[PDB]
Design an enzyme around this catalytic site. Structure first.
Site, PDB file in Angstrom:
ATOM      1  N   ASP A 127       2.365   0.743   3.604  1.00  0.00           N
ATOM      2  CA  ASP A 127       1.238  -0.092   3.232  1.00  0.00           C
ATOM      3  C   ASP A 127       1.060  -1.089   4.385  1.00  0.00           C
ATOM      4  O   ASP A 127       2.024  -1.702   4.844  1.00  0.00           O
ATOM      5  CB  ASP A 127       1.535  -0.831   1.939  1.00  0.00           C
ATOM      6  CG  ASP A 127       0.557  -1.935   1.691  1.00  0.00           C
ATOM      7  OD1 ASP A 127      -0.611  -1.677   1.326  1.00  0.00           O
ATOM      8  OD2 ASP A 127       0.955  -3.077   1.905  1.00  0.00           O
TER       9      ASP A 127
ATOM     10  N   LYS B  48      -2.026   3.932  -4.563  1.00  0.00           N
ATOM     11  CA  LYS B  48      -1.148   4.468  -3.543  1.00  0.00           C
ATOM     12  C   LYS B  48      -0.219   5.577  -4.008  1.00  0.00           C
ATOM     13  O   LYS B  48       0.235   6.376  -3.192  1.00  0.00           O
ATOM     14  CB  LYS B  48      -0.380   3.335  -2.863  1.00  0.00           C
ATOM     15  CG  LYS B  48      -1.293   2.410  -2.069  1.00  0.00           C
ATOM     16  CD  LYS B  48      -0.492   1.516  -1.136  1.00  0.00           C
ATOM     17  CE  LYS B  48      -1.372   0.504  -0.425  1.00  0.00           C
ATOM     18  NZ  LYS B  48      -1.536  -0.754  -1.224  1.00  0.00           N
TER      19      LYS B  48
HETATM   20 CA    CA Z   1       1.039  -5.094   0.593  1.00  0.00          CA
END
Ligand code: CA
Ligand code: CA
Ligand code: CA
Ligand code: CA
Ligand code: CA
Lengths: 225, 225
Positions: free
Chosen positions: B9, B152
Site C-alpha cells: 500500500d 485491497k
Molecule cells: Ca495506508
C-alpha cells in the site's frame, strides 16, 4: 454464470425463532442437491456438531465449524486452519479479571475459543483481544474469540479453490454483520426478510421469508429448485 | 515457503512525514526486484497516477488504483473491476443537500468516486451510502465512495490468481485501517513501526522504522534483498 455451490450460515438462516432447524429448509436443501447443487454449511459451532448436520441433514459439500477455522471434508477428514492455543490462553487470563467465561462446547473446539460475557465487559475485552491479533463477535449460541481472518470469507475462498469455481458460480446466504465477510466477496448473494439493512443492500435477492423459509424461495429464484 | 510477490500500500508505507515518496524505499524495491521479487503497488489514487508510479519508480508487477477497483497490468492494459456510474450518481444527488463535493481527480476515476465533505455530514452520508451497497472512508488525499468489496483484499486475491501463487508466497505491507483487508488474508504480513495497533498485532514482522525506511528492513527480514 450458473450457481454451482451455495454456502449457508447455519444459525443465521437454517433455524427458527427457537433456534430449531427448519424442516422446510432441510427439504429445500435436499431438493436443490438432487438437482445438482453443492451445499456447504458454515457455523460458529464445533466441528462434531456441524458434522452431525452434514450426515443427518444430508449435506453434499464440506462443512465448516468455528466460523471457518475448521472443516470436515467429503473424504471424511477434518482439517483445521488456525489454532486455539492463543485464544484459549487469552480467555484463561481474561476470565481472572472480567466476566468472560468458557462454555461447554469449548471441549470440542480446536481453532478458536467460544465464550460468554456480561455486556458491560464487551468493550474492554474487545480492545484487549484486538491488541492480541484476535477479534470477537456473537453468533449462534455464544461469543467467539477468533484469530484475525478466520471468518466466512476464508471459508468461501477455500470452497472456491476446492471446487475450482469462479466467484459468480457461488451463492452465499447470510443474515447479519458476521456474514459481511462473505457478502463482500464477488459472489452471488441472497438473504432473508429479517436480514440487516447492509446485508440486504448488497444482496442480489432479498427473500420475503425468514427463519428457514427463505431457503426455498432463494433456490427457486435462482432456478436451483 | 518463499515470498514471490509483495503487495504494498503506498500511502503511509512508501511515503514520509510530508507525504513524499521515500527514495530509500524506491531503491529497496528496485534492489529486491532485481533479485527476483515481483512488486505490486496499491493506493486510492486514480489509475494514471499509480501508472506514473509504476513507470517512474520501476514497479514490475500490476498496480492498483481506486483502492483495488482498477488495475494497470503488465501487458500495458487497464482493467476496471467496478463501475463509477452508481457512485457518481450518488455524489451528484448528495451534493444537492449536503456538503459532499466532487474533487478534481474524479476526472480520471473509473471505478469509484472521491469526495470532500464537512466532518459533521459524514454520518448522514455514510448511512445513505451503505443503503445503496457502497461504503465511505478517508484515505490518502480524500474521502472515497466505494462499492462494497472493492478493496485491497479483492486486489491481492486477483494477484494470487494472476501469478498462480499460494497465499504463503505473498507478502503484504500496510499501515492503516483501510489496509486491514489485506491482513485478513492468509498471507505473510509486515508493517512500519507507526502502523495502527491492530495492524501491528496481526503482522508477522513489525519494522523498527517508518516513512519508507521500513521497506528495506522488511525485505531483509524475509530474505528478499
Ligand atoms: Ca495506508
Ligand atoms: Ca449470521
Ligand atoms: Ca437469523
Ligand atoms: Ca454457535
Ligand atoms: Ca489521484
Amino acid at each position: 454464470h450458473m450457481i454451482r455451490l451455495a454456502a449457508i450460515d447455519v444459525d443465521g438462516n437454517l433455524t427458527d425463532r427457537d433456534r430449531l432447524i427448519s424442516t422446510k429448509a432441510i427439504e429445500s436443501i435436499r431438493s436443490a442437491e438432487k438437482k445438482g447443487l453443492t451445499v456447504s454449511l458454515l457455523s460458529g459451532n464445533v466441528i462434531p456438531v456441524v458434522y452431525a448436520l452434514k450426515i443427518f441433514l444430508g449435506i453434499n459439500g464440506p462443512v465448516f465449524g468455528e466460523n471457518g477455522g475448521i472443516m470436515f471434508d467429503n473424504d471424511g477428514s477434518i482439517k483445521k486452519f488456525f489454532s486455539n492455543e492463543g485464544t484459549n490462553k487469552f480467555l484463561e487470563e481474561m476470565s481472572k479479571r472480567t466476566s468472560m467465561r468458557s462454555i461447554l462446547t469449548n471441549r470440542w473446539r480446536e481453532a478458536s475459543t467460544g465464550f460468554d460475557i456480561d455486556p458491560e465487559d464487551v468493550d474492554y475485552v474487545r480492545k484487549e483481544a484486538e491488541s492480541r491479533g484476535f477479534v470477537i463477535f456473537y453468533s449462534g449460541y455464544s461469543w467467539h474469540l477468533m484469530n484475525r481472518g478466520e471468518d466466512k470469507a476464508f471459508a468461501v475462498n477455500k470452497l472456491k479453490e476446492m471446487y475450482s469455481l469462479e466467484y459468480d458460480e457461488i451463492l452465499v446466504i447470510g443474515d447479519s454483520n458476521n456474514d459481511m465477510p462473505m457478502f463482500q466477496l464477488p459472489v452471488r448473494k441472497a438473504c432473508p426478510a429479517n436480514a440487516t439493512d447492509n446485508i440486504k443492500a448488497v444482496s442480489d435477492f432479498v427473500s420475503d421469508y425468514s427463519y428457514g423459509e427463505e431457503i426455498g424461495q432463494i433456490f427457486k429464484h435462482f432456478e436451483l429448485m
